[PDB]
């Protein structure tokens, strides 16, 4: 018949190949689909949904509801930070297990801006001001408000608004960052400080709780699918 020559790679099975194969059930009448609410077209759509951050991962509070709450008080040390973490969406323990982190753990490269939200859950009679700062990498992590205010920052008034939003933009030397810990692709630092103190009147609670959320923006992308480390198996059923 037609002369042919077999090239390298014949009779191999690549799990990522895309070929045609015969159908074992010909002439099957498939059930037609219907319009079901909640259709998803892209995994990034899931990363754009805000989810709570387990900020407080202390020994006695981790793996518990209280790990989602950050304490605020009117007698706190105004010279010390409230919370601090690093901009590692997939490797930082406080961000790895979020929906964004779960999606990123299936990929190797990521890029884009991020959106952080903070919700204040005190009484209507409480007032105060907060400073939320982001610092690009390269220098010492901020330890005081004076160092933090030199980077990107936002001032939040609790009384007027119970929620605040801060957008961390994409600023990097490489076009894509790795989803694993690596100094060559570090992202920066996030810190919080008291601008003023929390003031409450009499017959009012002096301690309150704050919640945090994170999400991605429309300019976010991922690359090089890979398996995750959040699920394992030791025996087959």
């Amino acid at each position: 018949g037609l002369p042919v020559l077999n090239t390298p790679g014949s009779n191999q099975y690549l799990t990522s190949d895309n070929y045609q194969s015969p159908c074992a059930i010909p002439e099957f009448d498939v059930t037609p689909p219907i319009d079901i609410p909640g259709e998803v077209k892209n995994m990034m759509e899931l990363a754009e949904i805000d989810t709570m951050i387990p900020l407080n991962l202390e020994n006695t509070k981790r793996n518990t509801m209280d790990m989602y709450r950050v304490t605020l008080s009117d007698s706190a040390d105004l010279s010390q930070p409230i919370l601090c973490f690093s901009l590692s969406p997939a490797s930082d323990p406080r961000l790895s297990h979020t929906m964004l982190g779960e999606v990123l753990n299936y990929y190797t490269h990521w890029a884009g801006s991020l959106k952080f939200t903070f919700l204040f859950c005190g009484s209507m009679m409480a007032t105060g001001k907060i400073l939320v700062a982001y610092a690009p990498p390269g220098a010492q992590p901020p330890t005081s408000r004076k160092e933090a205010m030199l980077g990107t920052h936002v001032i939040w008034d609790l009384g007027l608004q119970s929620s605040c939003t801060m957008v961390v933009p994409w600023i990097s030397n490489v076009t894509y960052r790795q989803t694993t810990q690596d100094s060559f692709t570090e992202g920066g630092y996030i810190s919080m400080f008291y601008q003023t103190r929390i003031v409450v009147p009499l017959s009012t609670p002096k301690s309150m709780s704050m919640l945090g959320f994170v999400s991605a923006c429309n300019d976010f992308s991922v690359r090089l699918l890979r398996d995750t480390t959040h699920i394992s198996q030791s025996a087959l059923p």
């Binding site: 010909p26 509801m65 609670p205």
Partner: protein, 264 residues
């Protein structure tokens, strides 16, 4: 461009304010997936009580304190004994409906706390024993009263007379997933310093256009305290929480004798 021709005949082989409903009135809302409830499309005559079943029914009030861990309900299970809606449920083999859920909780300016309300499709909960999928029908359909969450997993170590009950865990959402991601589902937050009520509109969601309302629950409602309740410097604080649910665009089919499940 690259050339491609499909050889096989089969596609699979191819390479890849006041709201008033009926005779009820309650004085922003959230629509799940941006889809309003609707009747079945053009693609046995169904029965449709336009107003005898599409109205607000109020459940039993619950109490929120400093040790409450959460509450959950199943729909359409919670409305099985509400007027003619339950009668239509138990007189027909197939049913369909959407819902409008309204959560009410009022306090003062000196209180503080936050509630999270989540609407979950196909809300499956975990058991309380080594045996798998051993929960009973009666325990899985509490009805109006509903159930509660727990802060730890309490195994039922009794082989003589197993309870066959759910053992939800608050931080695992009762299904093995972290609570922080529950916001993926349709949700509302009631913060006492800003608002006092929540509203959600749920369309009909299922793999089939219509299905039995007795052996399958389409929706689950979960309420959890994201921040603990507090009031001034008082040791004990309790406030009421109320839930009101309205069926919307409800259809029934398959009329025969009445069904009488054995609830204990």
């Amino acid at each position: 461009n690259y050339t491609t021709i499909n050889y096989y005949k089969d596609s699979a082989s191819n390479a890849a304010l006041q709201l008033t409903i009926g005779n009820s009135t309650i004085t922003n809302s959230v629509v799940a997936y941006g889809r309003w409830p609707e009747f079945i499309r053009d693609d046995d005559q169904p029965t449709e009580p336009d107003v005898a079943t599409c109205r607000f029914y109020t459940l039993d009030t619950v109490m929120w304190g400093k040790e409450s861990k959460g509450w959950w309900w199943k729909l359409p299970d919670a409305l099985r004994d509400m007027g003619l809606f339950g009668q239509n449920m138990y007189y027909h083999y197939l049913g369909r409906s959407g819902y409008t859920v309204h959560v009410q909780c009022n306090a003062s300016k000196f209180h503080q706390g936050a509630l999270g309300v989540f609407a979950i499709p196909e809300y499956c909960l975990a058991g309380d024993s080594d045996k798998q999928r051993y929960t009973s029908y009666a325990n899985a359909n509490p009805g109006e009263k509903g159930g509660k969450f727990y802060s730890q997993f309490n195994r039922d170590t009794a082989v003589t007379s197993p309870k066959r009950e759910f053992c939800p865990v608050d931080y695992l959402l009762g299904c093995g997933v972290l609570l922080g991601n529950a916001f993926v589902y349709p949700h509302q937050i009631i913060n006492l310093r800003t608002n006092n009520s929540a509203t959600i509109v749920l369309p009909y969601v299922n793999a089939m256009a219509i299905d039995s309302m007795v052996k399958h629950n389409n929706w689950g409602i979960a309420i959890l305290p994201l921040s603990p309740l507090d009031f001034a410097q008082e040791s004990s604080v309790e406030i009421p929480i109320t839930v009101t649910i309205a069926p919307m665009c409800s259809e029934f089919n398959g009329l025969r004798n009445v069904t009488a499940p054995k609830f204990q």
